[PDB]
Every structure is written in C-alpha cells, then in structure tokens.
Design an enzyme around this catalytic site. Structure first.
Site, short mmCIF file in Angstrom:
data_model
loop_
_atom_site.label_atom_id
_atom_site.label_comp_id
_atom_site.label_asym_id
_atom_site.label_seq_id
_atom_site.Cartn_x
_atom_site.Cartn_y
_atom_site.Cartn_z
N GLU A 1 -2.61 71.87 -28.78
CA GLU A 1 -3.04 70.84 -27.83
C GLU A 1 -2.30 69.52 -28.00
O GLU A 1 -2.91 68.51 -28.35
CB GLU A 1 -4.55 70.60 -28.00
CG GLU A 1 -5.41 71.82 -27.70
CD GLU A 1 -6.88 71.64 -28.05
OE1 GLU A 1 -7.18 70.89 -28.99
OE2 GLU A 1 -7.74 72.26 -27.39
N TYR B 1 -12.34 65.34 -26.50
CA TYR B 1 -10.88 65.32 -26.45
C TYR B 1 -10.34 63.95 -26.05
O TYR B 1 -11.01 63.17 -25.36
CB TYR B 1 -10.35 66.37 -25.46
CG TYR B 1 -10.26 67.80 -25.99
CD1 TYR B 1 -10.96 68.19 -27.13
CD2 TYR B 1 -9.46 68.74 -25.35
CE1 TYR B 1 -10.86 69.49 -27.61
CE2 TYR B 1 -9.37 70.03 -25.82
CZ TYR B 1 -10.06 70.40 -26.94
OH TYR B 1 -9.95 71.69 -27.39
N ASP C 1 -15.10 80.12 -21.95
CA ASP C 1 -14.02 79.22 -21.57
C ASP C 1 -12.91 79.95 -20.84
O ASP C 1 -12.52 79.57 -19.75
CB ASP C 1 -13.45 78.55 -22.83
CG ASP C 1 -14.30 77.38 -23.29
OD1 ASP C 1 -15.36 77.14 -22.68
OD2 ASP C 1 -13.90 76.70 -24.25
N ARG D 1 -17.96 64.81 -32.91
CA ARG D 1 -17.23 64.25 -31.77
C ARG D 1 -18.03 63.14 -31.09
O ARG D 1 -18.38 63.22 -29.91
CB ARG D 1 -16.89 65.37 -30.77
CG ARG D 1 -15.97 66.42 -31.37
CD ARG D 1 -15.58 67.51 -30.40
NE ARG D 1 -14.61 68.41 -31.02
CZ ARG D 1 -14.12 69.51 -30.45
NH1 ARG D 1 -14.50 69.87 -29.23
NH2 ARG D 1 -13.24 70.24 -31.10
N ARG E 1 -2.77 68.73 -32.80
CA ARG E 1 -3.95 69.09 -33.58
C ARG E 1 -3.67 70.26 -34.52
O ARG E 1 -3.32 71.36 -34.08
CB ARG E 1 -5.10 69.44 -32.63
CG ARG E 1 -6.21 70.32 -33.23
CD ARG E 1 -7.23 70.64 -32.14
NE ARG E 1 -8.27 71.59 -32.53
CZ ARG E 1 -9.28 71.94 -31.74
NH1 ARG E 1 -9.38 71.40 -30.53
NH2 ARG E 1 -10.19 72.81 -32.16
C1 22N Z 1 -7.49 79.01 -29.14
C2 22N Z 1 -7.10 77.68 -29.77
C3 22N Z 1 -7.73 76.55 -28.96
C4 22N Z 1 -7.12 75.24 -29.35
C5 22N Z 1 -7.41 74.98 -30.81
O1 22N Z 1 -9.09 76.52 -29.27
C6 22N Z 1 -9.94 75.90 -28.38
C7 22N Z 1 -10.56 74.77 -28.97
C8 22N Z 1 -11.87 74.40 -28.69
C9 22N Z 1 -12.48 73.43 -29.45
O2 22N Z 1 -11.85 72.67 -30.16
O3 22N Z 1 -13.68 73.33 -29.42
C10 22N Z 1 -12.66 75.05 -27.72
C11 22N Z 1 -11.90 76.03 -26.89
N1 22N Z 1 -12.78 76.88 -26.09
C12 22N Z 1 -11.06 76.83 -27.81
N2 22N Z 1 -11.96 77.59 -28.70
C13 22N Z 1 -11.96 77.81 -30.05
C14 22N Z 1 -13.09 78.65 -30.58
O4 22N Z 1 -11.16 77.42 -30.85
#
Ligand code: 22N
Ligand code: 22N
Ligand code: 22N
Ligand code: 22N
Ligand code: NAG
Ligand code: NAG
Ligand code: NAG
Ligand code: NAG
Ligand code: CA
Ligand code: CA
Ligand code: CA
Ligand code: CA
Lengths: 390, 390, 390, 390
Positions: D197, D323, D70, D289, D212
């Site tokens: 987020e 999302y 990502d 989801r 969140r």
């Molecule tokens: C770093 C915090 C951010 C926001 C919760 O996290 C994101 C959420 C994600 C998620 O909810 O799947 C995917 C993103 N690739 C990122 N990764 C992880 C492993 O948490």
C-alpha cells in the site's frame, strides 16, 4: 465534428477483462433505481454508455409490480455512463421504447425506439436528442429491433429489424441511416430461418451480426452486411450450439446455412469473429438463463468445428444471467489500430426464478484483451426478496 | 453566439410520433419528484427542455397537500431536459412564477415568470440566468401569460399576456424583447373576444398563436403577429370546436372572427397551420379533461370547414389529460429546411377527479412526421392513491 | 481568461424584483437537503450561485439535532446554483468553514473558509478549487468574516475580517488577494465602533460595506475601501436604524461617525448607496428576526436624513427572516453599463422560535430594477414541526 | 492536450491546512451514500477527486452487512470531486476493483483496478474511461496495489504493486505506463523487507514512496523510483516509528535499510521528504487506528534522527482514524513553482470498534502551507449506531 471510420479489423483477443459492473439492484435496495431490462452498451469517441429500458418504476416501490406488460405505454429508453446504476438522477432520456437499439456515428448519438400497438408499431429514430425519422411496422406483428448497440461505419449507421411471428417465419430487414434519416433498406431472405435481437459489431468495413433464432434453432444466425446493403445470411458454422435452451454439445452437428437443434425459444446472445475462429457467448446451463461463459472455437466462423481452444467463465452457474450483446471500443478511446471487441452480460433477478413481485437486472461489462483472463463470477449480488415483496 | 432565424415555414406533417414521456408520477411514488403543473417544452439549438411549475413540494410528502393556492409565494418555474422527470436533483431553477413562458433566441434562454399579488403582479424577465427586465400589471387583475414556449425570430422574442377578468372582457397584449430587454409592445383589440394561455410557434416569419377563450367561446382564438407588432386577431375558422368544455361537432358552426358555442371555462390547447389546413388538438371528452386526439381539418385555417381528413389518438378517453401546447424543433437539430411542429400533452392526476390530497401531472411529447402514425395511449400510468393519501 | 472590471457605478434602482427562491425546507420534508445557515449569493460572469454552511446533516434526520455548536469540526461551505435547494446531489464542495466569504474574479472562484479552534482559527483561502493561501487568527478570539459575497475589482479581491470580542471592542482588518494569494492587508481603526459580518459590493471602483455593530449600535457601520487599502470608516448616516434589535425611528438620531441606539446584539444586514441616497434592508419587527422590508432614504448615505421616499416589503411580519446580504450582477450577465444591486434574505425556521430539534433556513433573492415593485411575502413556507420532531 | 511535468521539488511546508471534509457518514444517516473504504485523493490540472471502493451498498441498508468479504465480486472503484460525499448521484464509475490506484497524466485519468480470485487476480488498467491494458498476478497470491494516488511525470505514470504473503516475504514490483499501456516494469529486491500500500508523490523528477511493512517493521519502507526504473529501496531513516501497531518512541532505534520494531500488522500511511527532513503521518495511539498527527523530524529522511521540530494534530485520540495517503497539487492549480504536498486521512466507523453490522469511512483532506497550523480534530462525527443496526 468528425465521423468515426470503424473500418478496422476486430482485435484478436485471448480473453476478456472486466470493464464495469453497476451493482444496480444492490444499490436499489435503498437508492432510487429504475427497474430495467437489457443494459446494453454503446460507445461514442469520448465515453461508453449503458442504455436500458424502464417502466417508469423504481426498485422497492409498488409500481415495480411485474404484472405490467413488457410492451407498455410507459416503457422508455434511457441511459447513463457505463458502470453507473440506472438511477433516476444520473439518467438521460432517449426515446419512448419497448424495443431499442443505439449507436454513435462520431458526431452525435442515434437511437431507435419502438413503441405503439403490436398491430402497427412505430419506430422513432432519434438523432442528437430529437426525433428525425420514422419506420412503421411493415408486417403488422410487433415491429422490433436489436436491444443492443447498432453500428456506424463512416457516418452511416446500420441495424437489423424483425416484424412477424416470434416462433415461426417472420420477416427481417436491414435499415441504414445517416444523421437520423433513413437512406436505405433491404429485405433479408431467410426462408426456414429466424432472426431476433441481433448483436452486431463492425469488422473490416462490414457489419457482422450474431442473432437469436426463436423458431427451431439452437445455433445462432449470422448476418454479414455490406454498406450497399448486399448481405450474406446464415448460421454460425461452429459445431457447438450457443442459444438457450439447447441440447448437449456431443448431440449437436453444426451448419453454416441452416438451423440445427430442433428447439424453440432462445436468448439474446453474441459472438465475435477472429479471423476464422469465433468467440461465442452462452449461458452455462443448457436449459436456463444461469451462468455465463465465453468459448473460442478454432475455425468456428467458417467451419463446423468443435475445436474449443479457450474458455472463460464470467458468471458461475449458481447465479442468474440473461441477455448478452456486442459492442466495440472506438479507436479514439482504445488508442489501438483495431476494434476492441466487447460485451455486456445482463443478470436477471426476481420473477420468475425468485419470489418477488418484480424483475430487474444488472450488468457486468467485459472488454477483449491480449491475455488469458482467469475464471470468476461477477454476479448481481442482490439479496432477495426486498422490502416491497413482504 | 448565433441567433436562430426561425423564419422558415412549418413542416407539413401527416402525423405525430412520440418524442418523450417522463413518467414523473410513477417515479414519484418513491423518487424525489416535484408536484407540478404545465410541463411545457421549448428547444434551444442543442436540446429541448421541459419547463414546469412547482410549489416547492414533492410527491408523497405532506407539503403536496393541494389546499395551497396556485398563485402562492412558493410557486417557481424550473426545468429539466425533455423526457426527464421533474425531479429535484436534475432540476434547473428559472424564475419565481405562478405563470410563465420561456424560449431560446439561439444564444441564450429567456424566461418570463409572473409572481406577486393578484392586484399588482410582477413579470420578471430572465435572460441567460439573471433578471434583465420587468413588466408590472397594467390592469390590476392577475397579470398572466402563455404557460408554453414563447417564440424567437431572428433574435427577437415575442409572447402574449393577459390582464383582467378570467370570465369576461380582459385586456390582452403582445410583448417583444431582445436579450431580455423589452423593445416593443402592442395592445390587442378584441372586443367580445377572450385570450388566455396562448400556444404559439413561428411560421413564415410570423408568430402564430392558438389560445383559450375562457368567456363564451368553444372555438379557439387565433392571433398572428408580425415583427413590427401589427397583428391579425380572430378565431380558428374551422367548423369544429376544440376547447373544453364544448358542444358536439354537429351542433357547431365555425367563425373566423367571432367566438361560437356559448359556454364558459376552457383548457389550454394548440393548433398548427398547414398551408390552409389545420391540425387541432383537443380532449376526447366534450366535457372533461380526459383523452387527447389531434385532427387535421382541410382548409380549417382559412374556412369554416368541417372536412376532417386525419385523426390520431395519443391518450384514450379512459385516461386523464389536461393542458396542451405548441413548440417547434430548431432547424439546427432537425436538419430540416422547415420548422417541425411539435406538442406536449399534460396528464393530470389526483384532485379533483381522484381521491388524493394532491394534484400533479406528467407529459407525453410528440413531434410531427411525414407519415401516418397509429392510434395508441401513452397515459400517465401512476397507481392512485399514494402512501400519503392514506 | 478575463478579469471582471467591476469598476462601474451601482445602478440607481426604484425597487427590487424576485430573482429566485429555493424552497429548501419544504423540499427537505422529503428530499435530501442540507441543514444550513447563511444562503449567500455571489456571481461569476456565467452564473450566480448560492453558498451556504452545512453541518453534514440532512433535514428530517437525527443528525439535524441542533445541539451541535455552530463552530463545529463538521461545518463546511458548499454551493449550488441560485434558486436550487442546498441538496446533496447538486452541491459543490468549497471549503471547511464555520465562517465564510466567496467571490469570483472573472477567471475563477475564490473562497475563504474559517475553521479550527476559537483560540487560534485558520482561514484557508481557496482559488479555483484548491487551497492557495492561509490567514491565522491575529488576536486569538474567533477569527471570522463576512458570511456574504466578497468583492473583486480588476482581478484583485477584497474582504473584511474580525478577530476579538463579539460584544466589546474587537479588531477589524481588510484583506486583499489576487489569484488566491494575499497581496495586502490593513488594520481598521475604529475605537468605540464594532464591525461584524460585512455586506459589501463594488461601486465606482471602490468596495463599499454595510456591516453589523454587535456592541452598542442600532445603526450599521459603513466601510469604504480603496484599492490601495486606504479606507473610510464610520456609520450609515441616515437618521433611521436598520439593525435588530433596535428602537423606534422617532426615538433615533443618526450619525455618520458614531454608533447610536445603545443596544447590544445585531443581525447581518445590507445597504446600497444610490448617489447620496441609500437603500437599507431591515427586519420589520424592531426586536425579532421576522419580516423583511427595504427602505430608500433620500440623502441617507451622506446625511442624518429621515426622508423616506420608498419602501418595499418582501417578507411580511408574520414570517421569520434572518440574515441578509449584498451582491451585484456582473455586466457580462446583466448587459447593463452599471452594477445591478442585489440582495438575498435568509428565512430561519425551527429553534429557537418554533418547536423543533433543528434549525435551518431558505432564501429569497431579489435584484434591483428600474420600476416600483409591489409589496408581497415570499416566505419560507415549510410546515413545522417535521417527522423528526415527533 | 498537455502532459503535466511534475518534475518540480516538493514545497517545504510548516504545517497543513484543511482542504476538504465530506461528512459522508453523517449524510448517510438519511442520504444515499456508498459504504466505502480508502477515500484517496488525486488531482488533474482542473480538479482534485476523491476515489473510493464500494460494495454496491448504501449506508442504512441491509446490504451494508459487513459480512461480505473485502475482495468481493461486487467491489468497484468510483470517484467524486474532493469534499463531496461518496453518494450515488454524483459518483463516476472507474473500475471493477478490490484494490486500486489512480492518477492523471495531464491529458486523461488513468486508473488500475484489481479484481478476480486471490489465486490469479487481474489488474485492469483504465485510461480515459476505457480499459487499455492488463496485468495478471505474477505470483498467485492476491495481486494488489497502492490504495492511493499513483504518480505521473512528463506523461508516464508509475505505481507499486505487491503479490504474495501479507505477513512474510512477498514480491514487489514497479510498473510504468503511458496512455494506459504498460511500457516498463522492474522487480524490487527487498529480502527481509515488506512492501504494501505505497503512498507516493513526485519530487525532483523522481517518484518517492512511503509504504507499509506488514511483516516485522514498525518503521515504514521508502522506495525512490527513477524514470528508467532503477530504484533505491529501504526504510524511513528517522528514529521514530510511524506504523500501527508500534512500540514507544523511546524504545525505538531507526534504520535507513532495515525494518525495526519486531511487530506484525500495519496501517497504510504516508511521509513527505523536505530536503533532508521528513513529515511523517501516524495514528496517535500506538496500538489502535485512533487519532492522527503529523510530525516533522529534522534530518529524518537521511538520518536516524529523533529531533522532532514540528507536530500538528488533525484528529484527536478520542476519535477513529484509519488509512492515510499522499498526493500533490499540480502547479497548474496551485500557481506555485513547487509541488504542494497533501494528504487525506480516512476515518473508519462501525465494526470492529463499534456495535454496528457495517463499517464505512469518511475523510479529511489537508494541504501543506507556509505557516504553522493549530491543532484540532476534524473527526467523522456520525452518531452510531444507525437505524439499520437496530
Ligand atoms: C493482502 C494484503 C493487504 C495489504 C496489507 O491486506 C489488507 C489490509 C487490511 C488491513 O490493514 O486491515 C485489510 C484488507 N482487507 C486486507 N486484509 C488483511 C487481512 O490483511
Ligand atoms: C416478440 C419477439 C421478442 C424477441 C424474441 O420476444 C421477446 C423475448 C423475450 C424473452 O426472450 O424472454 C421476452 C420479451 N418480453 C419478448 N417476449 C416473448 C414472449 O417472446
Ligand atoms: C386567471 C386566468 C387563468 C387562465 C384562464 O386561469 C387559470 C386556469 C385554470 C384552469 O383552467 O383550471 C386553473 C388556474 N389555477 C387558473 N384558475 C382559474 C380559476 O381560472
Ligand atoms: C462571534 C461573532 C459572530 C458575529 C457577530 O457571532 C455570531 C452571530 C450569531 C447571531 O447573530 O446569532 C450566531 C453565530 N453562531 C455567532 N454567535 C454568537 C453567540 O454571537
Ligand atoms: C404486491 C401487490 O400488491 N401486487 C399486485 C396485487 O395486489 C394485485 O392483486 C394484482 C392485480 O390485481 O397486481 C399485483
Ligand atoms: C392530509 C392532510 O393532513 N390534509 C390537511 C388537513 O389535515 C388539514 O385539516 C387541512 C387544513 O386544516 O389541510 C389539508
Ligand atoms: C431528538 C433527540 O434525540 N435529541 C437529542 C436528545 O435525545 C439528547 O438527550 C440530547 C443530548 O443528550 O441531544 C439531543
Ligand atoms: C443484521 C443482519 O441481518 N445481519 C445478517 C444476519 O441476519 C445473518 O444471520 C448473517 C449471515 O447468516 O449475516 C448478517
Ligand atoms: Ca432458439
Ligand atoms: Ca371556452
Ligand atoms: Ca447592534
Ligand atoms: Ca508493521
């Protein structure tokens, strides 16, 4: 309806933040993307655009065969908005060109595209989307120009051109236009010096250029141009070389006047004056077009200094780089009272370094900011070879 | 909101500099590009555009099968900005058409597209993006028009149309419109003469046209049209033929009044008056549509002169050419006090000369300048045959 | 900033000239083109656009599998300029919709898109690019609307909607909006009558509609709507049927009030009032959606006339047609003091008539002119089946 | 030239009507479409746009290999008009970014794109198409932001950022900018709470956010921000959890102050205040989801209520969601005296749920209306796997 002044001073910056990255070659795996060189940026009061050279060919197509010569009858200048890929369906045509420069005077776009035979090339000036004037080769040996943004101050635009040998004494000239019409020119006296592919920007009402010596210099020529076309010409004072190839820093002694390093070849690059300091771009490797870093040398614009006070890595040494060039943000966009210094870095993929039949490039664009920015690598990222190479 | 005057004189030019080159067929190897004919240019006060005919088919697709007739129910007029390829995603629709002309009066675009059956075709005039008026065939034998820019002077636009045999006496007419509405017309009396595919431009408040005799003439008909639709009609005086096919220059005697050469067929072409001199375009080959040069004949507009004083090669005789036509730059774009003379050269690839199932073309556009320009060849450059041909 | 009046009378026309043809399916052989239905046209003061329904799928792709239902969750309304193909990269999104209508009030675009479940569908009104109001199904049986241009007079826009059985008595309503907000509605009393897919246009300050009886009528219902939503409802008087399927003209007796013909099913179609005469569109075949002609019946708007005085063929009976609908040119574009009557003809390719896995369509658009226009056939022209069908 | 006030109250709505659906992945089967995440919507006074993250890769191309991280050097923010697919040839470049937010102040677009290394990321603020200011990581652990529209009130724009652990106590900050320049910031004190987020919107002259908790909370944090950057922070009072994963409603007790549910992980989501009621979005499944519904809980903004008074299903539980985020319609577009509440739902296809090498998403956008809207499912609809997966 209004000319850009561009009389301000360049902003003193502590580092460079990412502006844009097109990912053109990754997209070109499937999309319809021009095979390009020199994705240089120039800005109007409303937007910045990436200009680039094409061969009329697309990534992953047989026409991308890289056996065609650079100075082909197919070579054109086109452009898109900064961050867009040089794709067919967003592209604006600019000029027939195997060498180019381009800048906006605040009212319209001016472009200069060089084409025709090496023995007697023609530089066609375009203003506002039509040809307006012409410059024929004055020395019969590959008339060529910056391959980066030209520079407009108070409605008049300036650029540097070369005609003659690419590895010995050539002839160098400064041209000046208003509304696409030539209004002045001046010969640059530079015996023993070599000027190619200048990277210019405005600063304090003058045009400052950091160029490429392709003769014997591992340091970069610097040309400072006043509106009456009087000029100052020499070399970037700093006791650190920024061309490629070059020798090691410890084996180098700087000069404000003369080329040092005794090596041939070169690569287009840039530098920004910061009072008396300089920001100098260079490939990380001393020998190849890989990696890209920018260094701030205290008093490097005026002294043979070796006092490095900043360094920022933008493309690691595991990845290919290429040409780099300068441009500024108009105050009408930045909202600042100075001229934000900016640069693009071309990232070359394919031949000769990799086994493909083709060569293209993509860009990362960075703009000067008031803060230190961490090292990282925004490299091209395409996965070679491509379907066409098989 | 303002009509273009276009009452000025044509600029006296010493040569022609490259404006644009689309590389449409090279791009079409992979991109989504219309199979076209007649990439003619016309300019509004803000931009020049390339118009072209399509069959609704794309390069490298089965529909590009060239067995479909020119005058098909699929044939449309579309356009893009000059230098762009006739690609799908940048194209503007103009008119249903297997014959066309188009020009801008300074406020809006007017286009005329001819379609329908040979026995009773319909020419639909479009103004500002909608049909506004109509012309039905007056002679029941393939109503057709210029295939190049029409001509607008002080808000009224003029063009030449033919109806009748393509190899014997036909009938020829001049039409005049304002805001897409027919306001006048005149029959051209030309017994023994033949007029096809006129290439016109404005000069000194008149419409001057250099056309194609497809009957017995190797020299080109010239028609000079005044705003009240009185006219002068004849042949290009010069003692050198510029149609194709034609005989050799030494075997030719010119005429201001009559067709010379005794040969059939022809090719659309152009010429520009320069006081009493002429610039005349022609294919290099006397027999085939290959190469393109332009010659300046001293006193060639008014005398049976053979005094050639300039010659510029734009496409060598090793490469295919095709149709050519005239247009001018608006003073609103050139910034000049005269009408810059300009031309496009179509470069035909595929059938019948080459082994493909299809035929298309691309363009090089050149504009008159105050300087001698060196010879070169900006040819199409596509690598035939294509995937679809296999 | 100004509302279109659209209070004028419809122009009396002697025939119809080609406006545009998109060639969408031919292009779709290689290009990226939406699989569509109902390419209906509507004009703003600056341009006309083709609207159309998509399934989110492209020609020559597996998703073009025609097993997906018309009223899918994927169905959207999109649009391009008239004559452009419904391609991805020129398309403007309009509304989620498996039924639609759209019109411009002179300031902005209003669209209505129906989606949701058959039992309780939702019609979302869009004005200027955002949802502004809503209409839920009032009868719980496939809320649906015109599939052609709606009609704006002096800033207020009107359209016809149906809710209920597609083969028996349904309920029919007239809605009225200003700036995307519902300001009025009226139930249409039509016992024994059936209204579907109305083709409307403005005339003399009223909204006139020619619709589709899908119950027992081979003649078309006519609904005339006044701004206070009082209305007149009945059938097209003419003693000639224009629905499909229908019986032969000689076996038909007209009616101003009642459905005649005793047949089910139908096809969307149009008609234009000319004083007391009518222009009526219809497929050439009595039984299938092939061919398209338009007939002028003297006194056919007001009398059970069989006096045919004009006939023009636009798609021969060897080629597929489909839906047809009405729209007018704004006086701001035509430059006329009347409302130029115009129509589009959809040309359906693929299932069920041909052996493909998909069905799409393309369009020919024609506008009324002051002259008789010759017969011809501007048919779709695509070469079936496609790569995907193999 | 005019700032949007956005000081109004959020409209009280009874349901949500479909605004747009892009069908990006279905189109991507053949078209040239970015592989994306987070298709979030934000509106200027003239249009709403979908923003999204790319990897520089296209659907059905090898580069769509989902093994790339990502937070890659290729990740960019781009945008198109709402309802358009994230295709290459309609896309506008915005910022280099693996985390983003974006909003329009009424004069220009402001975007913030985060990129660089996890240990020291850089958030580059863009205003009007150029970088204007910068925020470096203050805690050295993945500086990140909303992934939905930011919020502009009276010319000043606000957003929420996090820096620190994604599963324990992190640090949270509010930033405020005018014309792309930072003018204020505030640390959010939230011991034991977790903010990620945020989905924000303006209401009554304040910025309300529903975020969140990725630490221990199955209910969503709520942060209410005043223009002087004083704030109120807590949890959505309602006695029903709306994060994913979560437990069952009956096993839940609400809290206005503290996280409840004791579960890790989460999904970006939204909520809209309606006086004292709330509309809360959530996936239908408690654990995955899949599906998307929105519930109105009476007094749920201010009380631990379980009084559900409305429920609308927009994506059934047989289909993948992802999302979701909030935005509002400007009064300049809606024509209302309140701020129409709107949301987008991302629909994720591919890995890990399905057997492809790639993951992308498409969107359905819904806007609040004055009427109850029926349940249905506007799911993605793409047919997996794709050619590239074979
Ligand atoms: C770093 C915090 C951010 C926001 C919760 O996290 C994101 C959420 C994600 C998620 O909810 O799947 C995917 C993103 N690739 C990122 N990764 C992880 C492993 O948490
Ligand atoms: C002609 C002088 C110009 C500028 C140094 O040279 C260019 C530089 C290039 C280069 O640095 O690689 C490649 C261009 N194809 C051109 N070619 C050569 C062989 O020098
Ligand atoms: C009908 C007269 C028109 C103009 C001379 O002729 C055109 C010229 C053409 C040509 O010069 O090749 C090709 C066109 N397909 C058309 N065809 C023929 C056979 O003459
Ligand atoms: C529901 C009423 C509507 C308008 C008559 O009907 C439509 C007409 C259609 C048609 O005439 O073919 C096809 C549409 N898919 C829809 N389907 C059916 C089976 O009637
Ligand atoms: C991949 C490819 O075809 N490359 C071509 C090669 O076939 C050809 O031999 C050469 C010139 O002859 O140009 C290159
Ligand atoms: C490459 C190709 O298929 N060309 C077609 C050919 O197959 C066909 O026989 C002919 C007419 O029948 O039209 C052409
Ligand atoms: C060309 C094609 O694949 N068409 C598909 C078919 O494979 C499938 O069996 C059917 C539903 O099962 O939908 C359709
Ligand atoms: C479909 C595909 O090729 N996926 C690639 C795989 O080949 C490769 O092994 C892996 C990393 O090595 O990345 C992924
Ligand atoms: Ca060197
Ligand atoms: Ca001839
Ligand atoms: Ca019927
Ligand atoms: Ca959680």
């Amino acid at each position: 309806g209004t000319y850009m002044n561009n009389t301000e001073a360049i902003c003193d910056v502590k580092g460079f933040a990412p502006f844009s990255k097109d990912n053109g070659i990754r997209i070109g795996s499937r999309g319809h993307i021009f095979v390009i060189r020199e994705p240089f940026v120039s800005c109007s009061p409303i937007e910045c655009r990436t200009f680039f050279l094409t061969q009329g060919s697309l990534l992953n197509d047989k026409h991308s065969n890289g056996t065609v010569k650079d100075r082909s009858p197919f070579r054109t200048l086109m452009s898109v908005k900064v961050g867009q890929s040089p794709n067919v369906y967003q592209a604006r045509f600019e000029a027939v060109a195997w060498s180019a420069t381009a800048c906006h005077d605040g009212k319209k776009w001016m472009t200069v595209g060089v084409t025709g035979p090496d023995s007697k090339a023609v530089a066609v000036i375009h203003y506002g989307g039509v040809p307006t004037d012409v410059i024929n080769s004055w020395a019969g040996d590959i008339l060529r120009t910056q391959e980066s943004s030209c520079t407009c101050i108070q409605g008049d635009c300036y650029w540097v051109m070369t005609d003659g040998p690419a590895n010995r004494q050539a002839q160098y000239r400064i041209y000046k236009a208003n509304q696409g019409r030539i209004i002045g020119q001046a010969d640059i006296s530079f015996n023993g010096g070599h000027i190619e592919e200048c990277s210019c920007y405005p600063n304090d009402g003058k045009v400052e250029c950091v160029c490429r010596d392709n003769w014997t210099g591992t340091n970069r020529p610097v040309l400072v141009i006043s509106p009456d076309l009087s000029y100052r010409v020499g070399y970037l004072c700093a006791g650190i070389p920024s061309d490629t190839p070059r020798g090691e820093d410890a084996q180098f002694t700087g000069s404000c006047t003369s080329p040092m390093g005794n090596q041939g070849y070169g690569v287009k690059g840039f530098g920004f004056r910061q009072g008396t300091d300089v920001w100098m771009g260079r490939t990380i490797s001393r020998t190849s077009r890989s990696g890209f870093e920018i260094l701030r040398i205290k008093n490097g614009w005026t002294q043979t200094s070796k006092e490095q006070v900043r360094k920022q890595v933008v493309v690691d040494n595991l990845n290919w780089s290429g040409y780099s060039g300068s441009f500024t943000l108009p105050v009408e966009l930045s909202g600042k009272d100075c001229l934000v210094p900016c640069f693009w870095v071309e990232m070359i993929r394919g031949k000769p370094e990799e086994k493909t039949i083709w060569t293209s490039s993509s860009s990362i664009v960075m703009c000067g900011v008031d803060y230190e920015i961490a090292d990282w690598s925004w490299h091209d990222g395409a996965i070679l070879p491509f379907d066409i190479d098989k």
